[PDB]
Amino acid sequence: MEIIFYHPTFNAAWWVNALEKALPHARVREWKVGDNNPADYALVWQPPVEMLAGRRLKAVFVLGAGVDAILSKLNAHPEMLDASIPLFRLEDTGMGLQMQEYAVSQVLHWFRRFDDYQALKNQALWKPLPEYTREEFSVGIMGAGVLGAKVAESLQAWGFPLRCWSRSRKSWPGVESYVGREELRAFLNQTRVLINLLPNTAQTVGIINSELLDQLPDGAYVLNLARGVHVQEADLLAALDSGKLKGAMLDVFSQEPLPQESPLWRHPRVAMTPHIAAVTRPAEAIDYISRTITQLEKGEPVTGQVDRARGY
């Protein structure tokens, strides 16, 4: 079997060896312009259109959790991937734990008011502050998927009330599930820390704007771990300077890297990480990919399929 691989930042050599080692029957190769020789599978991330264009592939594996990049290309260039070719993505593969680290650290940080204590420090002002109660510090997670579930589970253990928002009702003990645009307002109602783990789709783009930010309590927080398009950077800045939002932390942005122009860099109550929240562990990825290929060759059940109708 032939396998092509493309990724603009990963070490192709490592993945080439790793996959061949996992699939002894296979011939894996790094793809690059001019490579129009046959292939059965493709492992990708930010692939050029000429790569998949008109190719007969049994499956395409996206090397991350998000598939918006490739789905937006497939929409502006429908000749890239034929609708018969199943698409896969990485579910967890170590990103679960990394999201739990980030979320638990930062939800605790705001709850203990370390953000204020750093403010007060920079002025050189010793000033104790009243504790927040747990009942007033609810955690709302938009996107209750593979990653949202891992996060909500790490926070539940700490006694914070938890709620989640998704398109389908979830029945997790110790968590309250809000569903669809009808319940979005309710979900935002008593949510203190807004955590975003939504996939970027035509249906979620820009969902965090002035309209959404008004439905949150004053002194609320925003932890954006999904994609930059989800938030209106000018509307975020305005909700902080007004007092609707106590603080925020962002790992993704409108444009990456973020240009120095951006006022986010200069605002003091905005923490920023350069799109590094969760990355796949290559060995766990190799395990999932090789197993799914084994199972696809045998016509047996598989996981991680992208439903292109829903768009994620």
Ligand X SMILES: NC(=O)C1=CN([C@@H]2O[C@H](COP(=O)(O)OP(=O)(O)OC[C@H]3O[C@@H](n4cnc5c(N)ncnc54)[C@H](OP(=O)(O)O)[C@@H]3O)[C@@H](O)[C@H]2O)C=CC1
Ligand Y SMILES: C[N+](C)(CCO)CCCS(=O)(=O)O
Calculate ∠ Cα 218-183-230, nearest 5°. Answer: 65
Residue 121 touches which member of Cl ion, ligand X, its own copies, none, C-beta under 5-8 Å by kind: its own copies
The interface region with ligand Y, picked from 46-54, 69-77, 109-117, 222-230 by CB under 6 A, is 46-54
Nearer to its own copies by Cβ, of 197 and 258: the residue is 258
Which backbone phi and psi does 159 adopt, to 5 degrees? 85, 10
Query: What x/- string results for residues 18 through 37 when contact with ligand Y is judged by CB under 6 A?
Result: ------------------x-
Order of all β-strands in the sheet with 41-44:
27-30, 2-5, 41-44, 59-62, 87-88
Q: Which of 65, 60, 42, 53 is nearest to 227 (CA)?
A: 65
Segment 111 to 130, residues that bind ligand X, using CB under 6 A: none
Residue nearest to ligand Y as judged by C-beta position: 54
Tokens 């203990």, located at residue: 112
Residue 252 interacting with ligand X (CB under 6 A) = yes
Which backbone phi and psi does 172 adopt, to 5 degrees? -105, 130
Cα–Cα distance, 190 to 161 (Å, whole number): 10
Nearer to ligand X by Cβ, of 31 and 253: the residue is 253
Residue 146 interacting with ligand X (CB under 6 A) = yes
Cα–Cα distance, 32 to 6 (Å, whole number): 8
Q: Which of 219, 167, 163 is nearest to 188 (CA)?
A: 163
Residue 11 touches which member of ligand X, its own copies, Cl ion, none, C-beta under 5-8 Å by kind: Cl ion
Cα–Cα distance, 123 to 100 (Å, whole number): 32
**Smallest gap from residue 173 Cβ to its own copies (A):** 17
Residue 78 interacting with ligand Y (CB under 6 A) = no
Q: Under a CB-based contact definition with an 8 Å cutoff, are residues 227 and 68 in contact?
A: yes
> What is the full DSSP assignment across 254-312?
SSSSPPTT-GGGT-TTEEE--S-S----HHHHHHHHHHHHHHHHTT-----B--TTTT-
Nearer to its own copies by Cβ, of 108 and 202: the residue is 108
Of 113, 192, 227, 230, the catalytic one is 227
Cα 184 to Cα 19, 120, 167, 227: the distances in Å are: 43, 35, 10, 19
Tokens, residue 106: 């930062």
To the query of whether residue 25 is one of the catalytic residues in this protein, the response is: no
**In this chain, which of 4, 59, 258, 293 binds its own copies, going by CB under 8 A?**
258
Tokens, residue 81: 């991937």
**In this chain, which of 11, 36, 203, 295 binds ligand X, going by CB under 6 A?**
203
Residue 223 interacting with ligand X (CB under 6 A) = no
First-to-last alpha carbon distance for the chain, in angstroms, is 28
To the query of whether residue 275 is one of the catalytic residues in this protein, the response is: yes
Query: What x/- string results for residues 48 through 77 when contact with ligand Y is judged by CB under 6 A?
Result: ---x-xxxx---------------------
Residue 234 interacting with its own copies (CB under 8 A) = no
**In this chain, which of 34, 133, 266, 309 binds its own copies, going by CB under 8 A?**
266
Q: At what angle do helices 114-123 and 95-111 cross, to 10 degrees?
A: 60
Segment 105 to 124, residues that bind its own copies, using CB under 8 A: 105-106, 108-109, 111-112, 114, 117-118, 120-121, 124
Residues that bind its own copies (CB under 8 A): 101-102, 104-106, 108-109, 111-112, 114, 117-118, 120-121, 124, 126-129, 158, 256-258, 260, 265-266, 270-276
Q: Give residues in contact with ligand Y (CB under 6 A).
A: 36, 38, 51, 53-56
Q: Which residues are catalytic?
A: 227, 275
Per CB under 6 A, residues contacting ligand X are 65-66, 91, 95, 143-148, 165-168, 197-201, 203-204, 225-227, 251-252, 275, 277-278, 312
User: What residues line the site for Cl ion (CB under 5 A)?
Assistant: 10-11, 64-66
